Design a protein around this ligand. Structure first.
Ligand SMILES: NC(=O)c1ccc[n+]([C@@H]2O[C@H](COP(=O)([O-])OP(=O)(O)OC[C@H]3O[C@@H](n4cnc5c(N)ncnc54)[C@H](O)[C@@H]3O)[C@@H](O)[C@H]2O)c1
Ligand SMILES: NC(=O)c1ccc[n+]([C@@H]2O[C@H](COP(=O)([O-])OP(=O)(O)OC[C@H]3O[C@@H](n4cnc5c(N)ncnc54)[C@H](O)[C@@H]3O)[C@@H](O)[C@H]2O)c1
Ligand SMILES: NC(=O)c1ccc[n+]([C@@H]2O[C@H](COP(=O)([O-])OP(=O)(O)OC[C@H]3O[C@@H](n4cnc5c(N)ncnc54)[C@H](O)[C@@H]3O)[C@@H](O)[C@H]2O)c1
Ligand SMILES: NC(=O)c1ccc[n+]([C@@H]2O[C@H](COP(=O)([O-])OP(=O)(O)OC[C@H]3O[C@@H](n4cnc5c(N)ncnc54)[C@H](O)[C@@H]3O)[C@@H](O)[C@H]2O)c1
Ligand SMILES: Nc1ncnc2[nH]cnc12
Ligand SMILES: Nc1ncnc2[nH]cnc12
Ligand SMILES: [K+]
Ligand SMILES: [K+]
Ligand SMILES: [K+]
Ligand SMILES: [K+]
Lengths: 462, 461, 461, 462
């Protein structure tokens, strides 16, 4: 009845979104089990959550779980291209404030986040934060510090965001405790790796429809994202080469059957065109950045790439690729939304039949979400079940209600306990129809664990 | 006139030396340490008791320790894992070694004793290198006085670490230890990729069975289980995985394996009624990888498909209830370390009976028992860590410290990540890989030194 | 003032052209034919009726035929396979095209007729290019007099070749045909690797389902079934395979798949009792690849696991008993070409019902229906064969022969291996591959010319 | 006792060979199915078969199937390194003439074949031939042409052998008809491909125990043997490159995810050191030849290969590699049997710690049989069921007893009917527990086949 506290592309997409949410719920048994387990107790009654994460169908199931458990929320996306407009519409049609659409400008992106922070032109009385990448966290600390006085905690989704939290902690500028949701095993080693395996080749196919088999790829980075991305491309038949600065991750790449190369001669990046391995890059049909670092696909690399190579980024921020250089020097031809040919023949105009161009996906933004739908529901199930458990834990601790001196001992960045990590994993396994074996009492004693777990020491790397 | 050894055949020494020279070219991290530390002689004065599979790879480790100044006395940590040409060549170099392929249990104990004792009295050892904890246990239980002079233990494998931690928790650990297993250049190299190379290797040498198109069940999905599953799936087996750890089970699913339990609903009640007989009746090959007890039990063995292969790649053979098979069924040796177990009864067998199982290596570590274990280029990473761990604890001189200082240092620790990275770097250069160097701005951006360490200690890789 | 077409939206032409320019750079064999033959205009005077999926790739084929001198009039061979931006770009270039995504059956027939008729009278066509045989059937059945002026037919796909051979068997085929399907650079490229690329693509676009760790059933293991199985296995699915051909089933076993039948003892007696209910109750995804009829039947659909995905990648939708589902179950459209089928009955459904199946493209070709079919660099091979096939038959002028000569010339043949190899070499070069040249001595050693053909006609690759 | 008509390395190995034969019988259901189906009718009663094929355990089961169906045989191996001494001992212990052992010289190889041809110093009354590679066939035509007057046919196992038969037929020199067993689908696309997949990495591990993951391989050829060999290495994690002269096979290698390269610049082999791609070969850790051609790993390639590379051949004959050049110029150091280090520092003497060497396996002979045990029983089941069917067919045809005008009509090289190819496959599939579905009558009519098969036209390539 007259609900207007939202901003989306097209509200008439709600029915479509609701049909896909109903499907996603059946693909998300950990999250839906939390919804059924905690609905009666209402553990988030009184929670007012500021949320900033890609407004996908999967985020929708997260949002409605939080609400089902008693929370009120205000939501935005954490990327200008990652929203699914039918998902945003369905959330708005349910009476939940949401400000998100695919294809936002940077100005519109900032406006959307501020519409969650401000209700009727004044600070909302928020008391919790859910974030993916740290942009909302940064705005609260820099622009709305007084609002953090009443906030009990932050649950942070992704590697880059965790890094920004830890910098604030070391510098003494973090105002509230956080849970690092990224480093649950059912998050980092599920979402970060297997998610990109599913969705990297997905986005490249939808953007270009290029055959990948038999072609040459260079993947920059071999962390969790680089591992899944490399697998995404190798399993399609690409000849994949991997770059790394971390020798242990490079050792893994070698043992996984990849050739380890550097874009720079002897791996020495002195900033000149001369240090580029021109012969290597002139053979590369596809380069993918996965690092969370800055300028790992730089201007000289872009100048040396094989004609018509595809360039994309699947790390959190677009500065992994020197796109600024390309805007300033080369002419952009839009093929379709989030697909651009970049003509290296000059800046003023281009020949429509020019052969010397590069194809950039999503303007260098997260490519799995920009050109496809990101990770699949059954994978995000694990990530968003951790999110819900982390919101419950920090809300229940009530950090904001301690005295100055009690906050001081509680101000940290923590992960969830392994027992809960395992309980999330068990529901995911059951979702596949898997059957976990149960230790006998003598077997539990033999290896020194409790029959119900946890089954590994906190040092275990899986 | 050197005679302080016992091996199968000293005339194999020339063959062993030829393979050691090749293996040196496959082990650049370990050999890089040998060249790096030869001048300093950091192990001069060290007297190391060593108990680890007497392979060609262990041979390269041994000579590196000696080149760095150590004296050693050596035995194998398994009755079937020795390569007799490796043993012969080490003995022919004047290094005390007591090991041969095919030891009895009695002979296995004698071999360890012969390193502990020299000329009838306890050797003046001051260091221990162990794989599985058998030597560590014999020292604590039968020779406690010798631990008064020992500076530490460097332990190779998951099971051995578990035994250390249990001793520490119980106040019975007498000296400090380094957990060599949990270096990333060990656990996530040796344990996983080593078994990937050597599991299917050992099954082929033992049976020459085709694997593509057949059904396997891998019990466990830790590091060894992950690598063993891959060893079989890459050959084209249809692989199912069992686990008690739901996180490891999650990894198996996402890796494309069906996760199942030998027991209905995963509940083992000790009766035949709880066995999933339909599942096991379809399994051509079962591999145990757990470090646990009786994970392929008698009821499972009674239910396996006729002619299935049974093997264990965990450290100890009690993963399989072989004792039950010895008591109730008739064993027919096909050839060394390959037996048909005839389920028709105890007293003799029909040579053309079709109701048998094939057991490899009598349930002992099958990659080392029926083949040669992990390849040189993989063991390179494990044994470089071993050398760095021996240097660190020998230089700490725990045995000489006053009691209060001992109490500060009586623990089980891992090597620093910086050293893990330097090992990995030489491994990568061995493949011809080129690591990229961060620029100052890039190192500042992610908050690391250009030289590393590149990850926090929490990182799981 | 060009109006001789009908497409969804002419304003999509500019986008269509941008994707065509990219496709040209992905199709070197095809574009190579443009350059080699353009000066000689071998298709001058050719008037080609074309019926094949109106994709971007088909657009490059069309413009190659035109660049070599032909006139054409085109329709799609499937109601869902058209890319509307490709048909718009062809129309805007002045070429008669009648095709859009989401045709009805009536509209499908109307579109084909618009190519046969120009200004209400039969077009003066003298060549036919077909994919599935629908246009060929209509000509033989409804416009026989037109075949008196046609020099031949070039047929793209296995199902259409079968229908040509039935006519040749019966003596009702009026003009000769080239079987384009059985070129190696078609069958073992398009049929296999094409579905490998585009099956998991279409399933992801339609459902966004995770595939890793779930159970799939692929009916059939010919070229399409081989590629489809790989499309799913490489994603981490556990794939089971059904076959009626023991040789193809043997290959599935060796490729690492479990071969199963939907029916007990493999006997399909048409009763529920025949269905392996435990098997069907485990299956998350079933894909039909056979070119046969009712290989995913009513009893199988009734037994499928709740929320299973059902799709067909064979040419015709009768592989799946969708008529049963239309008559008995209620259909809920998720989005275009994605329907939930509620097994609770016909009279409505509960929006939160859990007992449903997901059908893609209403049982039509799923790679073209829910995605964009094969990628350009694969269709390069297929369509370079098409072009050469068209020249081959057109230059032979069957229609100008007397009846006695036609009888000797009537046939269904494949292109000579030499042309097959020439196409293949251009495909290899597009990957940057370098083929090695035989020395004279080596050529003589194996009994071939340095220029090929390199294999006898019996070779299977 | 009394029986002395054989020559093997060590007769005391018979009991061990018998045990492995009993195991292999359970791995070979197609072959043991033929044994049980035809034992009663004794279709080979009166046949006297000269056999020349690798004296492995799998060949033992073939030999005893022929005898069980009524034949007498005299047997030798078709390679100096491929015999399993325990299989040879078991056959001799069963009273079957066999002349074979591992590690024959070239002279002993010729002697062994001659011992099958001659019994008691005069030609045996042979009337059938089973061959693998055509050596025995060539000796009969050249040195014992009168014996062919009594012989009803030849069943030839392998690609090279079939090639030699077709050239004799084209020249009018083939004296008896033959069955090309190689080109059954249950042979060529099972044995030649999947057999090398199983046995190539097997042999390299037994010989060197080298890690293969992360290393660079060059496979020369991509026919059936090259396809299986490339997969054998790739599945281990090797970075595999493929060379071919046939562009269709090259196209398959690209689509299968391999980079297609040539050892020669632009693929032009002009016999000069300048034509070698030294940068490419200086990066190769392992080269495998699979072609059935001559000198495809030549002297100039050998000179350019990375130090300590492994060199082996899995084609039928050793002249795929220029071992003669290596014998003439470099010093060979035997590591152990069938494993030699080839020191490129000179011909006379070597430094025991020299680093500039190559590792050659099996002296360039068939490496899977030389350094391991060849194909596994369950694969050879297909090959050898075809051999039994082919022997029965040609023996029952009785070519040597036909009138001249009938002889002329039947003097050819043929394959078995597709119906028998399918029947062999069915028993293989059942051996895995596979279940083949039966067409309904309607379905059979729809695709134009009989419910019983054959299911494909003879043009079908699978
Ligand atoms: N798109 C997605 O769906 C998604 C999902 C999860 C994470 N991410 C983002 O992707 C990025 C990577 O996350 P992660 O979990 O993989 O982090 P990670 O720390 O596990 O891996 C990143 C790797 O990049 C390497 N690297 C850094 N600088 C390099 C350089 N100059 N050249 C080569 N390699 C270099 C590091 O050594 C490290 O191994 C982060 O921004 C993260 O937030 C994206
Ligand atoms: N053969 C070799 O070369 C080799 C090499 C390294 C380690 N190992 C040995 O292999 C064993 C495994 O070592 P790891 O590093 O993989 O240890 P790990 O802890 O990583 O893996 C063992 C796994 O077994 C699982 N498990 C335990 N009981 C089970 C049961 N009843 N059913 C199913 N799964 C069960 C545990 O959950 C765990 O994930 C140890 O004995 C180790 O010493 C052998
Ligand atoms: N969608 C595409 O992109 C595409 C591409 C090429 C061909 N096709 C079509 O796909 C179909 C298959 O083509 P193909 O080249 O693989 O033909 P094919 O003859 O090589 O394979 C079909 C297989 O199905 C098997 N089969 C038949 N009936 C069966 C049954 N009842 N149960 C199980 N298996 C059964 C046959 O044994 C045969 O091996 C044809 O309709 C063809 O036109 C589609
Ligand atoms: N070792 C085994 O167990 C085994 C098994 C079967 C066959 N073989 C033998 O292996 C050989 C290959 O048999 P196949 O069935 O694969 O034959 P094939 O005809 O199918 O393949 C041989 C390939 O080598 C290629 N080739 C020829 N000369 C070349 C050159 N100079 N450079 C690169 N490629 C070149 C050809 O184009 C061809 O594709 C034959 O000698 C055969 O008898 C061995
Ligand atoms: N589908 C998705 N929804 C939300 N966050 C994501 N991150 C990656 N994929 C995602
Ligand atoms: N094991 C084997 N026995 C006989 N011939 C073979 N050819 C290849 N492998 C073989
Ligand atoms: K998604
Ligand atoms: K080894
Ligand atoms: K396409
Ligand atoms: K064998």
């Amino acid at each position: 009845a007259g609900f207007t506290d939202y901003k989306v592309a097209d509200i008439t997409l709600a029915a479509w979104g609701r049909r896909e949410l109903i499907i996603a719920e059946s693909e998300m048994p950990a999250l839906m089990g939390l919804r059924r387990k905690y609905a009666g107790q209402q553990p988030l009654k009184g929670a007012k959550i500021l949320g900033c994460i890609h407004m996908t169908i999967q985020t929708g199931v997260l949002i409605e779980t939080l609400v089902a458990l008693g929370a009120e929320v205000r939501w935005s996306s954490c990327n200008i291209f990652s929203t699914q407009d039918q998902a945003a519409a369905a959330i708005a049609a349910a009476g939940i404030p949401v400000f998100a659409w695919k294809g936002e400008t940077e100005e519109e992106y900032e406006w959307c986040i501020e519409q969650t922070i401000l209700k009727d032109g004044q600070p909302w009385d928020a008391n919790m934060v859910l974030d993916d990448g740290g942009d909302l966290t940064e705005i609260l600390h820099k622009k709305y510090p007084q609002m953090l006085e009443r906030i009990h905690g932050i649950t942070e989704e992704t590697t880059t965001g965790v890094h920004r939290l830890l910098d604030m902690l070391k510098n003494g500028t973090l105002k509230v405790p956080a849970i690092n949701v990224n480093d649950s095993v059912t998050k980092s080693k599920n979402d970060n790796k297997y998610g990109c395996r599913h969705s990297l080749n997905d986005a490249i196919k939808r953007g270009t429809d290029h055959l990948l088999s038999g072609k040459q790829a260079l993947v920059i980075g071999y962390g969790d994202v680089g591992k899944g991305s490399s697998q995404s491309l190798r399993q399609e038949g690409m000849i994949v080469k991997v770059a790394e600065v971390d020798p242990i991750c490079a050792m893994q790449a070698c043992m996984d059957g990849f050739e380890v190369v550097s874009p720079y001669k002897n791996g020495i990046n002195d900033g000149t065109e001369a240090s580029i391995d021109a012969a290597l890059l002139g053979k590369i049909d596809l380069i993918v950045t996965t690092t969370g670092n800055v300028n790992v696909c730089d201007a000289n690399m872009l100048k040396a790439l094989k004609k018509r190579a595809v360039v994309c980024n699947i790390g959190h921020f677009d500065n992994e690729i020197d796109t600024a250089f390309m805007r300033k020097n080369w002419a952009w031809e839009e093929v379709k939304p989030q697909v651009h040919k970049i003509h290296r023949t000059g800046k003023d105009g281009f020949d429509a039949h020019n052969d010397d161009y590069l194809i950039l996906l999503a303007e260098g933004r997260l490519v799995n979400l920009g050109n496809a739908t990101g990770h699949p529901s059954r994978i995000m199930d694990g990530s968003f079940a951790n999110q819900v458990l982390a919101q419950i834990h920090l809300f229940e601790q009530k950090y904001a209600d301690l005295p100055a001196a009690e906050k001081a001992k509680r101000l940290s960045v923590e992960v969830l306990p392994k027992k809960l990590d395992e309980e999330v994993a068990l529901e995911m396994v059951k979702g596949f129809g898997g059957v976990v074996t149960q230790l006998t009492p003598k077997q539990a004693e033999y290896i020194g664990v409790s029959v119900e777990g946890p089954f590994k020491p906190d040092t275990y790397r899986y």
